[PDB]
Amino acid sequence: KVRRIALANQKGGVGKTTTAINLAAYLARLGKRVLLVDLDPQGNATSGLGVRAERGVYHLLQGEPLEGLVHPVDGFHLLPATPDLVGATVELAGAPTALREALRDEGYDLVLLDAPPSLSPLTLNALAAAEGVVVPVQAEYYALEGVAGLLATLEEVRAGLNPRLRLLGILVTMYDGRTLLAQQVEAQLRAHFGEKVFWTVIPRNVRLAEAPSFGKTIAQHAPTSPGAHAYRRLAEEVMARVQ
Amino acid sequence: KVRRIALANQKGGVGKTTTAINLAAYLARLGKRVLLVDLDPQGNATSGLGVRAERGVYHLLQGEPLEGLVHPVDGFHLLPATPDLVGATVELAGAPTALREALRDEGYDLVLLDAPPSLSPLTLNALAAAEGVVVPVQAEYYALEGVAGLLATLEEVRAGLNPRLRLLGILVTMYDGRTLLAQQVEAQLRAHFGEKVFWTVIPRNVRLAEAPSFGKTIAQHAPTSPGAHAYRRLAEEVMARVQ
């Protein structure tokens, strides 16, 4: 049963964090108890939610209880990241199952882990603790090789650190509807990865791009904008795959 | 092997014909030899393609060869409808497998049949000749009962007239992104019909609404408009289901 979902890609980007934030927002609206964990030392998800805490995931790995670290936001709970997270990576290196053993989130239906790019010990800890992975990529030709690399990594992590790790799906984000180039890249992603690619595609849209600067989810910022409708649908497609 | 696809719903509407026209346009661009047959005495698809012929499907049932009746348009072939089609319905009634035996389209990869609403002898002839059905509905609450009715009809037609008849999918069209009501209706359609509903949803959009008046497919009229991107993706989702 997929309960923990890691959001990860090779190069990171706004699409990944925007996906973590909004997937969480809509899964919550579907009536799910959801925990979003910002595992990036940069704290993009945390900042994208207008949160400013001095206690975060580092303390979770540092022993301090979860219930007193989570911040309620837009219907779900966030375990924030701080510039303190950086410390644990030095030590998490060589300790891949750290996060997993420290994630006493049995009280949630779904747990989303916003992993940093470039496979750092934090990214690895996310992959070692998750059961499903959503790979958010931009509609650019590099995504073909970028995804291939990440899938090979997932295979190796499944084989040596986490047997229940599986790809939930590849998500095309920042689809530039102004061009036909976007169409061509998507077509090639589907031709090469097939059913692994979600049918729901997130469009490039001004309101979606600005939501993080406002520190609000797209549901809060512009609930009827194209990106909001797409993320609402994605939550449904993600639940369909989980089931 | 699904080769013939009927586009049908209970109440008809612009979404159905817009779907027949644009699905054909994009399946053609995928490198498929496609034949679109307008089976509606109203000739909405034919008019939506800027065609004006005096010879159509009636003559096909009237003996005259297909090759000399098809009109090339936007990369595919159209077997037009005329105000003459009405005649055959009187006689097609009681002759459900007429169209099927007169459809010598072995030269095409895919054949789309734009069926009239209200289950007329022409609608029935479409269902008796097709292998797959795409049910285009609008994101309105009536769609719940409208679809249920059509699915019951498909079941009965499969049982008594065409064993290979199957639902390819239910397509939500004219999704009004200005409201959250659209979201609620879609959610209910998926809750009630599940996987039968295509993940690709066609948005309500000005350029898409106007394409028929210009007599052009959305690919010709506004190739980078939201509806164009959605129909391009739908063709891919439809091919995935056919396979």
UniProtKB/Swiss-Prot annotation, chains A, B:
Parts of the chain that traverse the membrane: none
Effect of D40V: ATP hydrolysis-deficient. Forms only dimers in the presence of ATP
Stretch forming the signal peptide: none
Regulation (activators, inhibitors): ATPase activity is stimulated 10-fold in the presence of Spo0J and parS DNA (a plasmid centromere-like site or plasmid DNA itself). The first 20 residues of Spo0J stimulate its ATPase activity by 8%.
Binding annotation for ATP: K11, G12, G13, V14, G15, K16, T17, T18, P203, N205
PANTHER family: P-LOOP CONTAINING NUCLEOSIDE TRIPHOSPHATE HYDROLASE, PARA FAMILY PROTEIN CT_582
Family: Belongs to the ParA family.
Complex formation: Monomer in the absence of nucleotides or presence of ADP, in the presence of ATP is found in a monomer-dimer equilibrium. ATP-binding is required for DNA-binding. Probably interacts with Spo0J.
Name by which UniProt lists this protein: Chromosome-partitioning ATPase Soj
Source species of the chain: Thermus thermophilus (strain ATCC BAA-163 / DSM 7039 / HB27)
Lineage: Bacteria, Thermotogati, Deinococcota, Deinococci, Thermales
